[PDB]
Amino acid sequence: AAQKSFRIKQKMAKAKKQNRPLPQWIRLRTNNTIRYNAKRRNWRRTKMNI
Amino acid sequence: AQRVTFRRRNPYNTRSNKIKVVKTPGGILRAQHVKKLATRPKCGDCGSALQGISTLRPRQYATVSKTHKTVSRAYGGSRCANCVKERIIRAFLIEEQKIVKKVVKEQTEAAK
Amino acid sequence: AKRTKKVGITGKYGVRYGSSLRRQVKKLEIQQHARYDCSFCGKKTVKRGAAGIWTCSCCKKTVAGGAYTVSTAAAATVRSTIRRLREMVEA
Amino acid sequence: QKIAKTFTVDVSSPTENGVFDPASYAKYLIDHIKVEGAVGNLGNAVTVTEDGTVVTVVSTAKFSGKYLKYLTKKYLKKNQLRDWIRFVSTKTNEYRLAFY
Amino acid sequence: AHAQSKREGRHSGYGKRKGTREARLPSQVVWIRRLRVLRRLLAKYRDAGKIDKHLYHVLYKES
Amino acid sequence: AREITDIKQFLELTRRADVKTATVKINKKLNKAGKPFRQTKFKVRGSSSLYTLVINDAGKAKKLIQSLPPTLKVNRL
Amino acid sequence: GRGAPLAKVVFRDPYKYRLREEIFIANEGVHTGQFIYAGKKASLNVGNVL
RNA sequence: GGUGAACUAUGCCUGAAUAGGGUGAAGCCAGAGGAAACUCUGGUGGAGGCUCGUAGCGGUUCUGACGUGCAAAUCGAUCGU
RNA sequence: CAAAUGAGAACUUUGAAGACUGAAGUGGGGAAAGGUUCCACGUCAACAGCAGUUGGACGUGGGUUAGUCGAUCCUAAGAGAUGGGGAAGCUCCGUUUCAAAGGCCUGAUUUUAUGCAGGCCACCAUCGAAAGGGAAUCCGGUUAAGAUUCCGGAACCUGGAUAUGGAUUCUUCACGGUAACGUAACUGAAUGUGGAGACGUCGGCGCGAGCCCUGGGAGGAGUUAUCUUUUCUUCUUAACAGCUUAUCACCCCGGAAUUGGUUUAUCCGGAGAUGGGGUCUUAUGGCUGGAAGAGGCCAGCACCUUUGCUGGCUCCGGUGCGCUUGUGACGGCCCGUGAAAAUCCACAGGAAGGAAUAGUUUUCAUGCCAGGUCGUACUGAUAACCGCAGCAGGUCUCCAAGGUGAACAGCCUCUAGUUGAUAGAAUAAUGUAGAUAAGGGAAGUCGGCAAAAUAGAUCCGUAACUUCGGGAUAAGGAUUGGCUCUAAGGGUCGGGUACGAUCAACUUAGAACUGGUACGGACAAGGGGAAUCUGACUGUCUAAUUAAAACAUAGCAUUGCGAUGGUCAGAAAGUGAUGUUGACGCAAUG
If one counts every other C-beta atom within 10 angstroms of the C-beta of residue D88, the result is 12
The structure was resolved experimentally with cryo-EM
Q: How far is G40 from chain C (nearest CA, A)?
A: 15
Residue D30 near residue D24 (C-beta atoms within 8 A):
no
- Whether the beta carbon of C60 falls within 7 A of nucleic chain H: the reply is no
Element (H, E) at D54: strand D54-59
Residue D56 near residue D7 (C-beta atoms within 8 A):
yes
Looking only at the bridges linking them, the beta strands covering D54-59 and F2-4 are unpaired
Distance, in Å, from the CA atom of F72 to the CA atom of F19, rounded to the nearest integer, reads: 8
Distance, in Å, from the CA atom of E28 to the CA atom of E34, rounded to the nearest integer, reads: 10
Torsion sign over Cα B79, B81, B86, B90: positive
**Separation in Å, CA F71 to CA F15, F20, F68:** 11, 8, 9
Distance, in Å, from the CA atom of B51 to the CA atom of B65, rounded to the nearest integer, reads: 17
The 3-state DSSP class for residue D98 equals: strand
Cα–chain-centroid distance for residue B107?
Answer: 49
Residue F52 near residue F42 (C-beta atoms within 8 A):
yes
Radius of gyration of chain G (CA): 12
Please list, in sequence order, all residues whose beta carbon lies within 8 angstroms of the beta carbon of residue B60, skipping any fewer than 6 positions away.
B38
Residue F24 near residue F76 (C-beta atoms within 8 A):
yes
In chain I, which nucleotides are within 7 Å of a protein Cβ? 23, 27-37, 56-60, 69-70, 130-136, 138-141, 148, 153-158, 174-177, 179-188, 191-199, 204-206, 209-212, 216-226, 228-231, 234-242, 248-251, 258-269, 271, 279-284, 288-296, 298-300, 311-313, 321, 325-328, 332-337, 343-349, 363-368, 374-380, 384-386, 389-390, 396-401, 403-407, 456-459, 467-470, 479-487, 489-492, 505-510, 519-521, 536-537, 554-555, 579-582, 584-585
Distance, in Å, from the CA atom of A36 to the CA atom of A17, rounded to the nearest integer, reads: 16
DSSP secondary-structure letter at B68? G
Q: Which amino acid is at A8?
A: I
Distance, in Å, from the CA atom of C16 to the CA atom of F12, rounded to the nearest integer, reads: 82
Long-range CB pairs of D43-49, under 8 A, 24+ apart, other chains included: none
- Whether the beta carbon of B11 falls within 7 A of nucleic chain H: the reply is no
Chains C, G: CB pairs < 8 Å: 49
Please list, in sequence order, all residues whose beta carbon lies within 8 angstroms of the beta carbon of residue D32, skipping any fewer than 6 positions away.
D71, D74, D75
Return the exposure string of C39-65: e unless at least 16 CB atoms fall within 10 Å of the residue's CB, then b: eeeeeebbbbeeebbbbbeeeebbbbb
- Whether the beta carbon of B85 falls within 7 A of nucleic chain I: the reply is no
Please list, in sequence order, all residues whose beta carbon lies within 8 angstroms of the beta carbon of residue C59, skipping any fewer than 6 positions away.
C38, C40, C41, C43, C45
Beta bridge partners of C48: C54
Torsion sign over Cα D37, D38, D41, D47: positive
The residue length of chain E stands at 63
DSSP secondary-structure letter at D38? B
Return the exposure string of C18-34: e unless at least 16 CB atoms fall within 10 Å of the residue's CB, then b: eeeebeeebeebeebee
Query: With breaks defined as C to next N over 2.5 Å, after which residues does chain E break?
Result: none
D57: buried, middle or exposed (CB in 10 Å: 19+, 13-18, 0-12)?
Answer: buried
If one counts every other C-beta atom within 10 angstroms of the C-beta of residue E43, the result is 12
Please list, in sequence order, all residues whose beta carbon lies within 8 angstroms of the beta carbon of residue C69, skipping any fewer than 6 positions away.
C31, C32, C36
Q: Nearest CB to G44: which of C62, C63, C86? A: C86
DSSP secondary-structure letter at B62? H
G3: buried, middle or exposed (CB in 10 Å: 19+, 13-18, 0-12)?
Answer: exposed
